[PDB]
Amino acid sequence: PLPEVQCFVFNVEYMNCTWQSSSEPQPTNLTLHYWYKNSDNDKVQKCSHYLFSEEITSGCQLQKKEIHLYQTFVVQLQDPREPRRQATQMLKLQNLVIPWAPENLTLHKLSESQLELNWNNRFLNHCLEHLVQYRTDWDHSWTEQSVDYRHKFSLPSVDGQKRYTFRVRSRFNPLCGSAQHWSEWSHPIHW
Amino acid sequence: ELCDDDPPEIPHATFKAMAYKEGTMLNCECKRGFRRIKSGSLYMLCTSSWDNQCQCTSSHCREPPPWENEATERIYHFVVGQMVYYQCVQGYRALHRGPAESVCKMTHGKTRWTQPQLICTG
């Protein structure tokens, strides 16, 4: 029962494919092979850049040029001692892109009681949607708001007497991929 | 008019229907080296006659006419009330204890096929 491989594409800049191997007797260097099923260059590729945990294979890192979103990515884990103990997963890499967190969070008034939250993301943009969370020093929880490729957020009624905290995260969905996983949270900012 | 699963498999026997109830669907499957035509129908629907027509190219209702190229096994979707006759394949002796058919029935929202009371031995 081979370990599951999880692959993430980090800001479409590179990709970590990892697995925890420790769930087996005898310390084992499992190997990774991959291929792009049903396209040009569909040859079986060897890892070429192994990641290690406790001197045992734990992952693979693929460089930008090894990444083809939109093309079916097949990963194979292999027992080096027994060929028949192999497991393969078919992955859609555009569903596995993770953006770097939103940056340059600014607040700006268009009225004495209306503010606008703005921010930046490294590379993608039309390919990103956002989640805005805010709360006041008086709230027991975050208010959240889904935001499209306008990486803006309007707050039309704000209380000067209260202190606000805002944070934003981003996601590669739904226009250029269907990622389920969010970037990490931005640095929070306060009003 | 739903009928969830398909009729049970009896060892060394096959089943056929003589007459198909309205709501039955016959798939448009093709033989090896053949695919259903572009923009073709995925099935034929009994309404009585069949509302579509299956066709292949190189890569109550009656039993529909055999179209040019076909998968050997016809894939059907039956509906509640469909009776299905079982028989031991050529060379096999039939032992009967009760009905040799399966009928699609409908409980409290859950369809089922009755058990054909038939054993096949060589």
């Binding site: 979103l69 | 798939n27 979707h77």
Partner: protein, 120 residues
């Protein structure tokens, strides 16, 4: 312009994602019978003209759709038709391997997302 094309592609994407969401879920007990129908798949789909492959499967798509007893196939398919035709502008080659609707819808979604992402 690119922005017109990008918008058309998003709208096509949304129509397809609507169908996928509508069929691929609990509270659709038709799903497993729908999964048995064979859809035909583009050998290559990297550019707008490859949308010919989609167009030719719209008819069987509507049929699989019509099997839901809940979504509004006739309009929906007529809308996808007209957008596809605007976008596509050939001789479509299909893969040997057939697909379920789910695989078929996801292929076409991937196609759209693939072009949209380059468009800006």
């Amino acid at each position: 312009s690119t922005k017109k094309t990008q918008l058309q592609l998003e709208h096509l994407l949304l129509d397809l994602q609507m169908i996928l969401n509508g069929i691929n879920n609990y509270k659709n007990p038709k799903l497993t019978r729908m999964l048995t129908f064979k859809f035909y798949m583009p050998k290559k789909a990297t550019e707008l003209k490859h949308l010919q492959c989609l167009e030719e499967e719209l008819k069987p798509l509507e049929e699989v759709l019509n099997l839901a007893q809940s979504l509004r196939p006739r309009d929906l398919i007529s809308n996808i038709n007209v957008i596809v035709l605007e976008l596509k502008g050939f001789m479509c080659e299909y893969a040997d391997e057939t697909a379920t609707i789910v695989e078929f819808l996801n292929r076409w979604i991937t196609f759209c997302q693939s072009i949209i992402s380059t468009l800006t």
